[PDB]
Amino acid sequence: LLIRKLPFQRLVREIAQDFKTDLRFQSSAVMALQEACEAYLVGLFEDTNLCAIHAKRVTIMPKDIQLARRIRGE
């Protein structure tokens, strides 16, 4: 896994706190969220790279990410 555990945990609790109070978390739930986020980001970066090469570039720029996400339907 490529993201540090503790900042991810804190981010997850922060985001969750704005939907429902007093939540606790199972360890495996946070690890599940981390595998899912990292897999999603890796796939998005793959698509972004394809968009960058399409524009005769080798550097991914924000419009590449935004195009990938638009075609994905996000």
Binding site: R4, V12, I15, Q26, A29, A32, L33, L41, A52, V58
Partner: protein
Amino acid sequence: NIQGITKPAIRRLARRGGVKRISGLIYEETRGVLKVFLENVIRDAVTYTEHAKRKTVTAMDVVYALKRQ
């Protein structure tokens, strides 16, 4: 808390994705995208948790959230 997802972590994810060079503006965009994804998934997870009348998000809630999107 969003600032805890550091620049080298995003670099490491991009490296696994085959990216060789990364514009400086990429990092913030990536963080925003990540936040959106997380919001959606966690929203579903917590929705499942509430139906079961639990206070602990379980691994199965998360798996179900991923399945349903």
